[PDB]
Design a binder for this molecule. Structure first.
Ligand SMILES: O=c1ccn([C@H]2C[C@H](O)[C@@H](COP(=O)(O)OP(=O)(O)O)O2)c(=O)[nH]1
Ligand SMILES: O=c1ccn([C@H]2C[C@H](O)[C@@H](COP(=O)(O)OP(=O)(O)O)O2)c(=O)[nH]1
Ligand SMILES: O=c1ccn([C@H]2C[C@H](O)[C@@H](COP(=O)(O)OP(=O)(O)O)O2)c(=O)[nH]1
Ligand SMILES: [Cl-]
Ligand SMILES: [Mg+2]
Lengths: 124, 125, 124
Protein backbone atom coordinates (compact mmCIF):
# COMPACT_ATOMS: atom_id res chain seq x y z
CA UNK A 1 0.00 0.00 0.00
CA UNK A 2 2.62 2.58 -1.13
CA UNK A 3 2.43 6.35 -0.80
CA UNK A 4 2.17 7.68 -4.35
CA UNK A 5 4.02 10.92 -5.06
CA UNK A 6 4.45 13.28 -8.03
CA UNK A 7 7.32 15.55 -9.03
CA UNK A 8 5.89 18.94 -10.08
CA UNK A 9 9.13 19.73 -11.94
CA UNK A 10 12.27 17.71 -12.77
CA UNK A 11 14.08 19.68 -10.01
CA UNK A 12 12.33 17.58 -7.34
CA UNK A 13 14.26 14.81 -5.58
CA UNK A 14 12.43 11.64 -4.64
CA UNK A 15 12.42 11.58 -0.81
CA UNK A 16 15.05 9.13 0.45
CA UNK A 17 15.25 6.63 3.29
CA UNK A 18 18.68 5.39 4.34
CA UNK A 19 18.10 2.82 7.07
CA UNK A 20 15.36 0.54 8.54
CA UNK A 21 15.29 2.58 11.73
CA UNK A 22 15.24 6.11 10.29
CA UNK A 23 12.23 8.06 11.57
CA UNK A 24 11.23 9.36 8.14
CA UNK A 25 12.15 10.39 4.62
CA UNK A 26 14.72 13.04 3.61
CA UNK A 27 13.31 16.12 1.86
CA UNK A 28 15.30 18.23 -0.60
CA UNK A 29 15.10 21.76 -1.93
CA UNK A 30 13.98 22.04 -5.55
CA UNK A 31 15.27 25.66 -5.74
CA UNK A 32 18.03 28.03 -4.61
CA UNK A 33 17.25 30.30 -1.67
CA UNK A 34 19.05 32.71 0.66
CA UNK A 35 17.79 33.17 4.23
CA UNK A 36 19.11 36.21 6.18
CA UNK A 37 19.55 35.91 9.97
CA UNK A 38 16.29 36.27 11.90
CA UNK A 39 14.17 35.60 8.80
CA UNK A 40 12.32 32.54 7.46
CA UNK A 41 11.63 31.14 3.99
CA UNK A 42 9.20 28.67 2.43
CA UNK A 43 11.30 26.05 0.61
CA UNK A 44 9.54 24.27 -2.28
CA UNK A 45 10.28 20.52 -2.63
CA UNK A 46 8.14 20.17 -5.79
CA UNK A 47 6.86 16.91 -4.29
CA UNK A 48 3.16 16.19 -3.76
CA UNK A 49 1.84 13.03 -2.12
CA UNK A 50 -1.40 11.15 -1.64
CA UNK A 51 -0.81 10.70 2.08
CA UNK A 52 -1.68 7.63 4.18
CA UNK A 53 -4.92 7.45 6.19
CA UNK A 54 -5.01 8.31 9.92
CA UNK A 55 -1.61 9.95 9.64
CA UNK A 56 -0.07 13.34 9.03
CA UNK A 57 3.34 14.17 7.59
CA UNK A 58 5.43 16.08 10.12
CA UNK A 59 8.14 18.26 8.62
CA UNK A 60 10.76 17.62 11.30
CA UNK A 61 14.21 19.20 11.66
CA UNK A 62 17.53 17.72 10.67
CA UNK A 63 19.91 17.53 13.63
CA UNK A 64 22.93 19.13 11.94
CA UNK A 65 20.88 22.11 10.74
CA UNK A 66 19.14 22.52 14.13
CA UNK A 67 22.64 22.84 15.65
CA UNK A 68 23.42 25.60 13.10
CA UNK A 69 20.40 27.53 14.38
CA UNK A 70 18.04 26.38 11.62
CA UNK A 71 14.59 25.61 13.00
CA UNK A 72 11.31 24.47 11.39
CA UNK A 73 8.04 26.47 11.17
CA UNK A 74 4.55 25.07 10.52
CA UNK A 75 5.24 21.52 9.43
CA UNK A 76 1.82 19.82 9.54
CA UNK A 77 1.15 18.03 6.25
CA UNK A 78 -2.49 16.97 6.35
CA UNK A 79 -3.53 13.57 5.05
CA UNK A 80 -5.72 15.36 2.48
CA UNK A 81 -2.95 17.70 1.21
CA UNK A 82 -2.33 17.13 -2.52
CA UNK A 83 -0.22 20.26 -3.11
CA UNK A 84 3.49 21.14 -3.17
CA UNK A 85 5.09 20.12 0.15
CA UNK A 86 6.85 23.17 1.60
CA UNK A 87 9.47 23.35 4.33
CA UNK A 88 9.52 26.56 6.38
CA UNK A 89 13.15 26.95 7.38
CA UNK A 90 13.71 29.50 10.15
CA UNK A 91 17.18 30.99 10.38
CA UNK A 92 17.69 31.62 14.09
CA UNK A 93 21.46 31.72 13.57
CA UNK A 94 23.67 34.80 13.43
CA UNK A 95 24.69 34.39 9.78
CA UNK A 96 22.99 34.08 6.38
CA UNK A 97 21.92 30.52 5.47
CA UNK A 98 22.10 29.33 1.84
CA UNK A 99 19.83 26.72 0.28
CA UNK A 100 20.98 25.09 -2.98
CA UNK A 101 18.87 22.88 -5.25
CA UNK A 102 19.22 19.27 -4.06
CA UNK A 103 20.16 20.19 -0.47
CA UNK A 104 18.67 18.08 2.32
CA UNK A 105 16.48 20.41 4.39
CA UNK A 106 14.21 18.23 6.54
CA UNK A 107 12.78 14.78 7.18
CA UNK A 108 9.14 13.84 6.63
CA UNK A 109 7.71 11.64 9.40
CA UNK A 110 4.44 9.76 8.96
CA UNK A 111 2.96 10.20 12.40
CA UNK A 112 0.05 8.01 13.45
CA UNK A 113 -2.86 10.02 14.81
CA UNK A 114 -6.43 9.66 16.06
CA UNK A 115 -9.63 11.35 14.78
CA UNK A 116 -12.10 11.28 17.71
CA UNK A 117 -15.58 12.73 17.61
CA UNK A 118 -15.80 15.47 20.23
CA UNK A 119 -18.79 15.97 22.50
CA UNK A 120 -19.27 18.76 25.02
CA UNK A 121 -20.11 17.62 28.54
CA UNK A 122 -21.08 19.58 31.70
CA UNK A 123 -18.00 18.31 33.61
CA UNK A 124 -15.10 15.84 33.28
CA UNK B 1 -13.44 4.54 19.29
CA UNK B 2 -15.53 6.55 21.81
CA UNK B 3 -15.93 10.37 21.75
CA UNK B 4 -13.53 12.78 23.47
CA UNK B 5 -15.44 14.66 26.18
CA UNK B 6 -14.66 18.37 26.57
CA UNK B 7 -15.89 21.24 28.74
CA UNK B 8 -16.35 24.93 27.95
CA UNK B 9 -15.10 26.68 31.08
CA UNK B 10 -16.83 29.90 30.02
CA UNK B 11 -19.17 30.98 27.20
CA UNK B 12 -16.03 32.35 25.46
CA UNK B 13 -14.68 28.88 24.64
CA UNK B 14 -15.28 27.49 21.15
CA UNK B 15 -15.61 23.78 20.35
CA UNK B 16 -12.48 22.33 18.73
CA UNK B 17 -13.42 21.58 15.12
CA UNK B 18 -11.71 19.71 12.30
CA UNK B 19 -11.87 21.70 9.07
CA UNK B 20 -12.11 18.55 6.92
CA UNK B 21 -12.15 14.72 7.31
CA UNK B 22 -8.54 14.67 6.05
CA UNK B 23 -7.35 17.44 8.39
CA UNK B 24 -4.69 16.47 10.96
CA UNK B 25 -5.86 18.73 13.77
CA UNK B 26 -8.73 20.36 15.65
CA UNK B 27 -8.91 24.19 15.61
CA UNK B 28 -8.08 25.91 18.89
CA UNK B 29 -9.52 29.40 19.40
CA UNK B 30 -8.58 32.31 21.65
CA UNK B 31 -11.11 32.93 24.42
CA UNK B 32 -9.66 36.38 25.18
CA UNK B 33 -8.08 39.48 23.64
CA UNK B 34 -4.30 39.74 23.54
CA UNK B 35 -1.51 41.83 22.11
CA UNK B 36 1.84 40.09 21.54
CA UNK B 37 4.85 42.38 20.84
CA UNK B 38 7.71 41.24 18.55
CA UNK B 39 10.19 38.95 20.32
CA UNK B 40 7.59 37.96 22.94
CA UNK B 41 5.34 34.98 23.74
CA UNK B 42 1.85 34.72 25.27
CA UNK B 43 -0.10 31.99 27.01
CA UNK B 44 -3.43 32.10 25.19
CA UNK B 45 -6.42 30.65 27.07
CA UNK B 46 -8.84 28.49 25.07
CA UNK B 47 -11.17 27.98 28.05
CA UNK B 48 -11.47 24.38 26.85
CA UNK B 49 -10.60 21.37 29.00
CA UNK B 50 -10.91 17.76 27.83
CA UNK B 51 -10.62 14.18 28.98
CA UNK B 52 -7.95 13.04 26.55
CA UNK B 53 -7.95 9.69 24.72
CA UNK B 54 -5.87 6.76 25.99
CA UNK B 55 -2.32 6.08 24.74
CA UNK B 56 -2.34 9.51 23.10
CA UNK B 57 -1.28 13.09 23.74
CA UNK B 58 -2.60 16.32 22.27
CA UNK B 59 0.03 18.23 20.30
CA UNK B 60 -0.60 21.96 20.06
CA UNK B 61 0.61 22.45 16.48
CA UNK B 62 0.99 25.63 14.41
CA UNK B 63 -1.25 26.89 11.62
CA UNK B 64 0.59 27.28 8.28
CA UNK B 65 -0.51 30.89 7.69
CA UNK B 66 0.59 32.11 11.12
CA UNK B 67 3.96 30.27 10.76
CA UNK B 68 4.63 32.13 7.51
CA UNK B 69 3.85 35.37 9.39
CA UNK B 70 6.43 34.45 12.05
CA UNK B 71 4.05 32.98 14.64
CA UNK B 72 5.48 29.83 16.24
CA UNK B 73 4.30 27.48 19.02
CA UNK B 74 5.93 26.91 22.42
CA UNK B 75 5.40 23.90 24.70
CA UNK B 76 2.44 22.08 23.21
CA UNK B 77 2.30 18.78 25.11
CA UNK B 78 -1.21 18.11 26.49
CA UNK B 79 -0.91 14.99 28.62
CA UNK B 80 -3.60 12.27 28.58
CA UNK B 81 -4.32 12.91 32.29
CA UNK B 82 -4.47 16.72 31.98
CA UNK B 83 -7.84 18.01 33.20
CA UNK B 84 -7.21 21.77 33.24
CA UNK B 85 -7.64 24.67 30.79
CA UNK B 86 -5.74 24.09 27.54
CA UNK B 87 -3.35 26.98 26.91
CA UNK B 88 -1.45 27.88 23.75
CA UNK B 89 1.96 29.51 23.90
CA UNK B 90 2.09 31.75 20.83
CA UNK B 91 5.53 33.11 20.01
CA UNK B 92 5.74 36.34 18.00
CA UNK B 93 8.89 35.97 15.90
CA UNK B 94 7.55 38.50 13.38
CA UNK B 95 8.77 42.09 13.12
CA UNK B 96 5.48 43.71 14.16
CA UNK B 97 2.92 43.42 16.98
CA UNK B 98 0.59 40.43 16.66
CA UNK B 99 -3.00 40.95 17.77
CA UNK B 100 -5.12 38.10 19.10
CA UNK B 101 -8.89 38.61 19.17
CA UNK B 102 -11.50 36.46 20.92
CA UNK B 103 -12.54 33.71 18.51
CA UNK B 104 -9.35 33.83 16.44
CA UNK B 105 -7.93 30.45 15.55
CA UNK B 106 -4.46 30.25 17.04
CA UNK B 107 -3.34 26.63 16.69
CA UNK B 108 -4.46 23.08 15.95
CA UNK B 109 -4.74 20.13 18.32
CA UNK B 110 -3.41 16.82 16.96
CA UNK B 111 -4.19 13.64 18.86
CA UNK B 112 -0.84 11.90 18.45
CA UNK B 113 -0.61 8.16 19.14
CA UNK B 114 2.17 7.16 21.55
CA UNK B 115 3.70 4.28 23.54
CA UNK B 116 4.25 3.91 27.27
CA UNK B 117 6.93 1.21 27.44
CA UNK B 118 8.63 0.04 30.62
CA UNK B 119 12.23 1.23 30.90
CA UNK B 120 14.93 -1.25 31.93
CA UNK B 121 18.50 -0.21 32.80
CA UNK B 122 21.09 -2.48 31.21
CA UNK B 123 24.91 -2.52 31.09
CA UNK B 124 25.13 -2.87 27.28
CA UNK B 125 22.84 -2.64 24.23
CA UNK C 1 8.71 -4.63 24.25
CA UNK C 2 10.53 -2.89 27.14
CA UNK C 3 13.02 -0.16 26.23
CA UNK C 4 16.55 -1.12 27.29
CA UNK C 5 18.71 1.87 28.33
CA UNK C 6 22.34 2.54 29.37
CA UNK C 7 23.86 5.19 31.63
CA UNK C 8 27.13 6.28 29.98
CA UNK C 9 28.30 7.84 33.25
CA UNK C 10 26.94 7.75 36.82
CA UNK C 11 25.87 11.37 36.22
CA UNK C 12 22.95 10.07 34.13
CA UNK C 13 19.45 9.79 35.63
CA UNK C 14 16.79 7.23 34.70
CA UNK C 15 14.00 8.68 32.52
CA UNK C 16 10.63 8.40 34.31
CA UNK C 17 6.99 9.37 33.78
CA UNK C 18 5.54 11.69 36.43
CA UNK C 19 2.11 10.02 36.27
CA UNK C 20 0.39 7.08 34.47
CA UNK C 21 -1.20 9.60 32.06
CA UNK C 22 1.99 11.57 31.32
CA UNK C 23 3.05 11.66 27.65
CA UNK C 24 6.77 11.91 28.23
CA UNK C 25 9.60 10.32 30.13
CA UNK C 26 11.59 13.11 31.78
CA UNK C 27 15.10 13.78 30.57
CA UNK C 28 17.81 15.30 32.74
CA UNK C 29 21.07 17.15 32.07
CA UNK C 30 24.15 15.13 33.02
CA UNK C 31 26.36 18.28 33.06
CA UNK C 32 26.49 22.00 33.93
CA UNK C 33 25.55 24.37 31.12
CA UNK C 34 25.04 28.12 30.65
CA UNK C 35 22.93 29.30 27.70
CA UNK C 36 23.04 33.02 26.74
CA UNK C 37 19.89 34.76 25.44
CA UNK C 38 19.26 34.09 21.73
CA UNK C 39 21.54 31.04 21.79
CA UNK C 40 21.16 27.24 21.84
CA UNK C 41 23.06 24.37 23.44
CA UNK C 42 23.18 20.64 22.82
CA UNK C 43 22.69 19.03 26.24
CA UNK C 44 23.96 15.53 27.03
CA UNK C 45 21.70 13.19 29.04
CA UNK C 46 24.29 10.37 29.12
CA UNK C 47 21.45 8.00 28.25
CA UNK C 48 21.30 5.63 25.27
CA UNK C 49 18.31 3.43 24.37
CA UNK C 50 17.35 0.55 22.16
CA UNK C 51 14.28 2.38 20.82
CA UNK C 52 10.97 0.55 20.21
CA UNK C 53 9.73 -0.54 16.77
CA UNK C 54 7.71 1.75 14.47
CA UNK C 55 8.44 4.62 16.79
CA UNK C 56 10.72 7.59 17.24
CA UNK C 57 11.46 9.49 20.43
CA UNK C 58 10.51 13.16 20.25
CA UNK C 59 12.47 15.53 22.47
CA UNK C 60 9.53 17.67 23.58
CA UNK C 61 9.41 20.80 25.77
CA UNK C 62 8.55 21.13 29.43
CA UNK C 63 5.72 23.65 29.78
CA UNK C 64 7.14 25.82 32.59
CA UNK C 65 10.43 26.17 30.73
CA UNK C 66 8.56 27.09 27.54
CA UNK C 67 6.83 29.94 29.40
CA UNK C 68 10.32 31.22 30.31
CA UNK C 69 11.22 31.22 26.61
CA UNK C 70 13.10 27.90 26.55
CA UNK C 71 12.41 26.00 23.33
CA UNK C 72 13.53 22.66 21.83
CA UNK C 73 15.61 22.35 18.65
CA UNK C 74 16.10 19.24 16.52
CA UNK C 75 14.69 16.50 18.72
CA UNK C 76 14.16 13.51 16.44
CA UNK C 77 15.58 10.35 18.03
CA UNK C 78 15.49 7.66 15.34
CA UNK C 79 14.56 4.08 16.12
CA UNK C 80 18.11 2.97 15.19
CA UNK C 81 19.91 5.64 17.24
CA UNK C 82 22.15 3.95 19.84
CA UNK C 83 24.17 7.00 20.89
CA UNK C 84 24.03 9.62 23.64
CA UNK C 85 20.65 11.36 23.66
CA UNK C 86 21.13 15.11 23.32
CA UNK C 87 18.54 17.79 24.04
CA UNK C 88 18.97 21.05 22.11
CA UNK C 89 17.75 23.78 24.46
CA UNK C 90 17.13 27.11 22.73
CA UNK C 91 17.20 30.11 25.04
CA UNK C 92 14.70 32.51 23.48
CA UNK C 93 14.41 34.32 26.80
CA UNK C 94 15.99 37.66 27.69
CA UNK C 95 18.38 36.53 30.45
CA UNK C 96 21.04 33.81 30.69
CA UNK C 97 19.63 30.32 31.30
CA UNK C 98 21.49 28.02 33.69
CA UNK C 99 21.46 24.24 33.53
CA UNK C 100 22.72 22.32 36.58
CA UNK C 101 23.68 18.64 36.53
CA UNK C 102 20.48 16.69 37.21
CA UNK C 103 18.11 19.45 36.06
CA UNK C 104 14.94 18.37 34.26
CA UNK C 105 15.21 19.92 30.79
CA UNK C 106 12.85 18.00 28.47
CA UNK C 107 10.60 15.00 28.03
CA UNK C 108 10.88 12.04 25.70
CA UNK C 109 7.68 10.93 23.96
CA UNK C 110 7.59 7.59 22.11
CA UNK C 111 5.60 8.57 19.03
CA UNK C 112 4.02 5.87 16.86
CA UNK C 113 4.91 6.20 13.18
CA UNK C 114 4.34 4.57 9.80
CA UNK C 115 7.08 3.44 7.43
CA UNK C 116 5.29 3.32 4.08
CA UNK C 117 6.77 2.61 0.65
CA UNK C 118 7.06 5.49 -1.82
CA UNK C 119 6.22 5.20 -5.52
CA UNK C 120 6.51 7.96 -8.11
CA UNK C 121 3.53 8.43 -10.42
CA UNK C 122 2.52 10.93 -13.14
CA UNK C 123 -0.74 11.85 -11.40
CA UNK C 124 -2.22 11.17 -7.94
O1 LIG D 1 5.10 23.87 6.75
C1 LIG D 1 4.11 23.56 6.06
C2 LIG D 1 2.83 23.66 6.60
C3 LIG D 1 1.74 23.32 5.80
N1 LIG D 1 1.92 22.91 4.52
C4 LIG D 1 0.77 22.53 3.68
C5 LIG D 1 0.12 21.25 4.19
C6 LIG D 1 -1.17 21.73 4.83
O2 LIG D 1 -2.23 20.79 4.65
C7 LIG D 1 -1.48 23.05 4.15
C8 LIG D 1 -2.17 24.04 5.08
O3 LIG D 1 -2.63 25.16 4.32
P1 LIG D 1 -3.85 26.12 4.79
O4 LIG D 1 -5.08 25.72 4.01
O5 LIG D 1 -3.37 27.54 4.65
O6 LIG D 1 -4.08 25.74 6.35
P2 LIG D 1 -3.80 26.65 7.66
O7 LIG D 1 -5.17 27.04 8.14
O8 LIG D 1 -3.09 25.67 8.58
O9 LIG D 1 -2.97 27.84 7.24
O10 LIG D 1 -0.22 23.56 3.72
C9 LIG D 1 3.24 22.83 4.01
O11 LIG D 1 3.45 22.44 2.84
N2 LIG D 1 4.28 23.16 4.79
O1 LIG E 1 1.54 24.65 25.77
C1 LIG E 1 1.04 24.04 26.74
C2 LIG E 1 1.81 23.14 27.46
C3 LIG E 1 1.23 22.46 28.53
N1 LIG E 1 -0.06 22.68 28.87
C4 LIG E 1 -0.70 21.97 29.98
C5 LIG E 1 -1.03 20.55 29.53
C6 LIG E 1 -0.01 19.68 30.23
O2 LIG E 1 -0.51 18.37 30.54
C7 LIG E 1 0.35 20.48 31.47
C8 LIG E 1 1.79 20.23 31.89
O3 LIG E 1 2.03 20.88 33.13
P1 LIG E 1 3.20 20.39 34.13
O4 LIG E 1 3.45 18.92 33.93
O5 LIG E 1 2.83 20.92 35.50
O6 LIG E 1 4.44 21.29 33.63
P2 LIG E 1 5.86 20.76 33.08
O7 LIG E 1 5.60 20.45 31.62
O8 LIG E 1 6.76 21.95 33.31
O9 LIG E 1 6.21 19.54 33.90
O10 LIG E 1 0.15 21.85 31.12
C9 LIG E 1 -0.83 23.59 28.11
O11 LIG E 1 -2.03 23.81 28.41
N2 LIG E 1 -0.25 24.24 27.08
O1 LIG F 1 18.05 16.77 19.37
C1 LIG F 1 18.60 15.74 18.93
C2 LIG F 1 18.57 15.45 17.56
C3 LIG F 1 19.20 14.29 17.10
N1 LIG F 1 19.82 13.47 17.98
C4 LIG F 1 20.48 12.22 17.53
C5 LIG F 1 19.39 11.16 17.33
C6 LIG F 1 19.32 11.01 15.83
O2 LIG F 1 18.98 9.68 15.45
C7 LIG F 1 20.70 11.40 15.34
C8 LIG F 1 20.63 12.02 13.96
O3 LIG F 1 21.89 12.61 13.61
P1 LIG F 1 22.36 12.72 12.07
O4 LIG F 1 21.48 11.82 11.24
O5 LIG F 1 23.86 12.50 12.07
O6 LIG F 1 22.10 14.27 11.71
P2 LIG F 1 21.11 14.78 10.54
O7 LIG F 1 19.72 14.60 11.13
O8 LIG F 1 21.53 16.22 10.31
O9 LIG F 1 21.39 13.88 9.37
O10 LIG F 1 21.21 12.33 16.30
C9 LIG F 1 19.82 13.80 19.35
O11 LIG F 1 20.39 13.05 20.19
N2 LIG F 1 19.22 14.91 19.78
CL1 LIG G 1 5.27 15.75 16.96
MG1 LIG H 1 5.54 17.33 34.02
Amino acid sequence: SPVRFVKETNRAKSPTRQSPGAAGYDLYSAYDYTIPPGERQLIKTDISMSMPKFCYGRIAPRSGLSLKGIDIGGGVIDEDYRGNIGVILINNGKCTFNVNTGDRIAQLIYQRIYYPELEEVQSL
